[PDB]
Design a protein around this ligand. Structure first.
Ligand SMILES: CCCCSC[C@H]1CN(Cc2c[nH]c3c(N)ncnc23)C[C@@H]1O
Ligand SMILES: CCCCSC[C@H]1CN(Cc2c[nH]c3c(N)ncnc23)C[C@@H]1O
Lengths: 229, 230
C-alpha cells in the first residue's frame, strides 16, 4: 500500500483521476481516495494547506489505512541555483525552517522531542532516482527540503532560511509535518515535488502560472515510482 | 459525556493523570492517552508532546478514536499582558498562529490558507472556566487572544514582531493553535486554560524551568474544577 499526500486539489487531481474502484472518504476537511493505480494499492490524501492540516491528515492516513510508505507530492519554491519551473526536487531530509527552541540547546529548526532533521527513506530515494531515469527531459535535484507555515516570497525571509539552512534546495508548507508524523509512526517517507517558483518577489505570479506544470511534473514522477514497487 | 484534556509536557499532565480512576493507558505515535473517570466524569487525557505537529497529530488521534465532546488545552504559557505574573491563569477567547504568513495571497497575518483567521473558543467552555476561577481567589486571570508558534519566545525582537501583528496577545505558547485548528476541522468545541511560567524575555528559560511546576498546579486546579462543572 502506497500512501500519497498532497495539500491542494490541483496537486492531487492528476493522480485522483487515474485510480480505479475509487472509494472517496472525506473527514475533518481531508479527503481520502483509496483504490488501485495499475494494480498497486494506493491511498491519496488531500490534506489542505500548512503544517497543522498536513499533520492531522497524515495522522488520520497512517492510523486508519496503515500504508507501507508515504510519498509527498506537489509544488515547491526553489532555492537551488539550477532549478527552473517544472524541475523536480527529491528530499534527502526534511527540516522545519520556522522551528526555534534554541533557548534549550536544540539546534535551529529542531523541535523539542524531535530529531534536527527527518531523513527520507533510502529505498524510496533510490526508487525516485529510478523513476527520474524514466523522464529523460526533466531535471531534478536531491537535497534538504525546508518547511514552514509561510509562503516564502520576500528577500528577508529567503535570507533567514539560507542562513540557517545553507544546503536547502527547496521550500514548502507541509513536508516537515508529514515527515515528523511519519517519524513518530515509524513509517518510511519521501518527498518528491516540482518547482513552481523561486521564492522571491515574483513567486505569487510564478506560482499562479506554474502550479499546473509543477503538479504535472510531480505527478508524473509519482506515477512512475508507483509502478517501481 | 466525555472531556478531552490535552497537555504537551509530562509535567503539565502529571497532576491530572494521578486523579483518573480506572485509568487505561495507550502509547501510540509517541503520544499517550489516559482514559477513565474523575469524580464520575468520563475523560481522556492526552500528552501530545511539544510543538504544532505533535499537537495536531495527537489531537487528530484523540478525536477520531475517542470522540470527546469537548477539548480543554492545559499547561504553561509565556505572558504578554502586563498584569500577568507567574502562576496567573490565561483563558483563550480565541487562538491564532503568530507564525503563519500567507499574506502574499490575500490572507491576513497569522491566517493559514483555507482556515479562519482565528479559532474562537466555545462560549459555554469560556463560561465554565470563568466559574472555575470564581473558586480560586488569589489567582489572577486574563481572558483573551492566545498566539501559537513553533518557537519558544525569549527575545525582544520576536516579542516585538508578535505584538506588532497581534497587538492584543495576552499570551504565547506552542500547541494551542494546532489543537484549536484541528478541533475546528473536526467541529469539536475547545478552550485553552493555561498558566504563566515566564514573561517571554531573556530570563524566560530559567523562569520557565523554575515555574513550570507552579503553572502546572495553577492550570490543573482550573481544569479539575471545570471537569466537576461539566
Ligand atoms: C492561495 C493558495 C495559497 C498557496 S500557499 C503555497 C502552497 C504551495 N505549496 C508549495 C510551495 C510552492 N511555492 C512555495 C513558496 N514560495 N513557499 C512555500 N511553499 C511553496 C505549499 C502550499 O501548500
Ligand atoms: C524543555 C523542553 C522545551 C520547552 S519548550 C516550551 C514548552 C512550554 N509550553 C508553553 C510555554 C511557556 N512559555 C513559553 C514561551 N516563552 N514561548 C512559547 N511557549 C511557551 C510550550 C512548549 O511546549
Amino acid at each position: 500500500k502506497i500512501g500519497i499526500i498532497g495539500a491542494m486539489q490541483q496537486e492531487v487531481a492528476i493522480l485522483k483521476d487515474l485510480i480505479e474502484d475509487v472509494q472517496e472518504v472525506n473527514q475533518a476537511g481531508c479527503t481520502f481516495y483509496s483504490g488501485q493505480i495499475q494494480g498497486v494499492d494506493v491511498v491519496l490524501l488531500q490534506s489542505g494547506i500548512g503544517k497543522v492540516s498536513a499533520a492531522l491528515g497524515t495522522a488520520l492516513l497512517i492510523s486508519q489505512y496503515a500504508p507501507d510508505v508515504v510519498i509527498n507530492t506537489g509544488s515547491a519554491g526553489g532555492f537551488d541555483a539550477s532549478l527552473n519551473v517544472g524541475d523536480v526536487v527529491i528530499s534527502s531530509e526534511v527540516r522545519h525552517h520556522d522551528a526555534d527552541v534554541t533557548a534549550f540547546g536544540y539546534e535551529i529548526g529542531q523541535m523539542a522531542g524531535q530529531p534536527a532533521a527527518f531523513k527520507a527513506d533510502e529505498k524510496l530515494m533510490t526508487v525516485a532516482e529510478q523513476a527520474l531515469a524514466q523522464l529523460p527531459n526533466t531535471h531534478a535535484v536531491r537535497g534538504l527540503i525546508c518547511t514552514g507555515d509561510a509562503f516564502v516570497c520576500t528577500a528577508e525571509r529567503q535570507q533567514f532560511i539560507r542562513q540557517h539552512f545553507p544546503s536547502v534546495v527547496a521550500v514548502e508548507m507541509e513536508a516537515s509535518a508529514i515527515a515528523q508524523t511519519c517519524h513518530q509512526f515509524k513509517v518510511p517517507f519521501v518527498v518528491v515535488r516540482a518547482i513552481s517558483d523561486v521564492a522571491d518577489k515574483e513567486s505569487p505570479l510564478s506560482f499562479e502560472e506554474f502550479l499546473p506544470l509543477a503538479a504535472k511534473s510531480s505527478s508524473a514522477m509519482v506515477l512512475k515510482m508507483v509502478e517501481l514497487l
